[PDB]
Amino acid sequence: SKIERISAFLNDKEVDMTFITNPTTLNYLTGLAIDPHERIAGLMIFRDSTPMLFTPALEVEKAKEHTSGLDIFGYEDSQNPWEVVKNHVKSDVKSIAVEFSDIPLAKTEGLKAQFGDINFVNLTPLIERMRLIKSADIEKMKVAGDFADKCFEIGFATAAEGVTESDIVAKIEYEMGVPQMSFDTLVLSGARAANPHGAPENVEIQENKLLLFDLGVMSGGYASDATRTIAIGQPNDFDAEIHKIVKEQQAAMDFIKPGVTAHEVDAVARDLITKAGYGEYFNHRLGHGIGMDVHEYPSIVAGNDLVIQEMCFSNEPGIYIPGKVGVRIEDCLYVTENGCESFTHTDHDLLI
C-alpha cells in the first residue's frame, strides 16, 4: 500500500503526522482527484492511527466515493481550516511532514498558529522515489500515449487546404475534446521549429518545409508526450535527412534495458549527432521522466550516472539551427527487461 509506505517513513523518522498538499500527490495516494484551489485540503497519515483527510465543507460527501478507507471531514468558509484540523486530531503533534516543493508559508504558518513550534520535515523526496517506479497503472499511460497517436492523426490531415499552425492546434483540441492536454500543444513550421521559444501562432504552414507537432494528453490521471516531424509537400534535401541523423528515435529504443548509466542514452544519441556534426545546436537535455506529471524523474542529462531499472521517461533528440529547417522526435517509454517499449505507435518515417 502506498499509504503504508508513508507510516513506515513517519515511524522510521519519528515524525507524528503528515499534512499533504500537492493535489497530484493526493490522487496518486487516494485515487481521488480534488482541486481546492484557493481553499485547504490535506492528507493526514499517522504512525499508528487511522489516516484522515481534510476537505472543504463542499468536497466531502464526494470524497467518500474514494474510500479506501480514510476518515473524511471538512470546514465551511465561516471557520478556520487550521482550527478544525487541531479539533479533530487528538494525541500530540511535534513533527509534521509536508511536501516542501509544494506547501506555501501561508499554510505552514496556519499550522503553527494552531499546533505550536512544529519541526517540518521534507516528504517530497520520498514521494519522488515512489513515483519513479509505477508498474501499477503503465496501462493508463498506454491509453494516453495512444490518444496522442490519434492526435497526430487529426493533425496531419488538418494540414491541407490557408490553414495556420493555430487552426491545427485548435482542431486537435476540439478532437469531445478529451479533458486536458498534458502541456501546450506545439505545431511549428520550417524555421519556426528551431526557435527555443517557438510557439504556434496564426501563420500559414510553409509548403516544401518541415512541420513539427509535439503534443500530449491527460487521460483521467496520467499523461503522454510525443514529437513527430513531417513534411508538407516535397521536402528539401538538406532538411530531408537532417531527419535521418535524428530518426536514427531508433539508436536507443530497444538498445535500452536496465542497469546502464544516465550518461547512457544521452551518449548513444548526443554522439550519433556529432557523427554528422551538429553536436551543438542540439543544446538541451535529452530525456525527462513521465508519469502523472508530464515532467518527473528521471532526468537524463549528460553528467552523472543514475542506473536504470523499472522507470518512465522520454526520447526527444532534435537539431535546431536558428533560421533552420525544423526537426525533433520523441515517444516516452517504460523499462521492462526485454527489450522495452514506447507509448506512441505512429510512423517515424512520413510526409503529407
The residues binding a second copy (CB under 8 A) are 38, 58, 62, 77, 98, 100-106, 108-109, 120, 122, 124, 166, 169-171, 173-177, 196-197, 202, 285, 295, 301
Distance CA 338, CA 279 (A): 30
Distance CA 254, CA 145 (A): 18
Element (H, E) at 127: helix 124-131
Element (H, E) at 146: helix 139-158
Q: How far is the CB of 288 from Mn ion (least distance, A)?
A: 9
Give the distance between the most distant pair of CA atoms in the chain.
Answer: 73
Q: Choose between 280 and 310: whose C-beta lies nearer to a second copy.
A: 280
Q: Choose between 45 and 103: whose C-beta lies nearer to a second copy.
A: 103
Q: How far is the CB of 213 from a second copy (least distance, A)?
A: 17
Using CB under 5 A as the binding rule, whether residue 266 contacts Mn ion is answered as: no
Q: Choose between 13 and 345: whose C-beta lies nearer to a second copy.
A: 13
Name the residue type at position 175: E
Name the residue type at position 117: D
Residue 117, contacted partner among a second copy, Mn ion, none, CB below 5-8 A by kind: none
Using CB under 5 A as the binding rule, whether residue 59 contacts Mn ion is answered as: no
Q: Choose between 101 and 261: whose C-beta lies nearer to a second copy.
A: 101
Q: Choose between 162 and 177: whose C-beta lies nearer to a second copy.
A: 177
DSSP assignment of 164-185: BHHHHHHHHHH----SEESS--
Residue 225, contacted partner among Mn ion, a second copy, none, CB below 5-8 A by kind: Mn ion
Residue 289's DSSP bridge partners are 296, 313
Q: Locate cell 556529432: which residue?
A: 274
The footprint of Mn ion on residues 318-337 (CB under 5 A) is: 330
Task: Note whether 214 and 230 are within 8 A (CB).
Answer: no
Strands 71-75 and 52-56: parallel
Residue 169, contacted partner among a second copy, Mn ion, none, CB below 5-8 A by kind: a second copy
**214 assigned binding-site residue:** yes
φ/ψ (deg, to 5) at 342: -110, 150
From residue 64 to residue 103, the character string flagging contacts with Mn ion as x (rule: CB under 5 A) and all else as - is ----------------------------------------
Binding site for Mn(2+): residue ranges?
A: 214, 225, 288, 316, 330
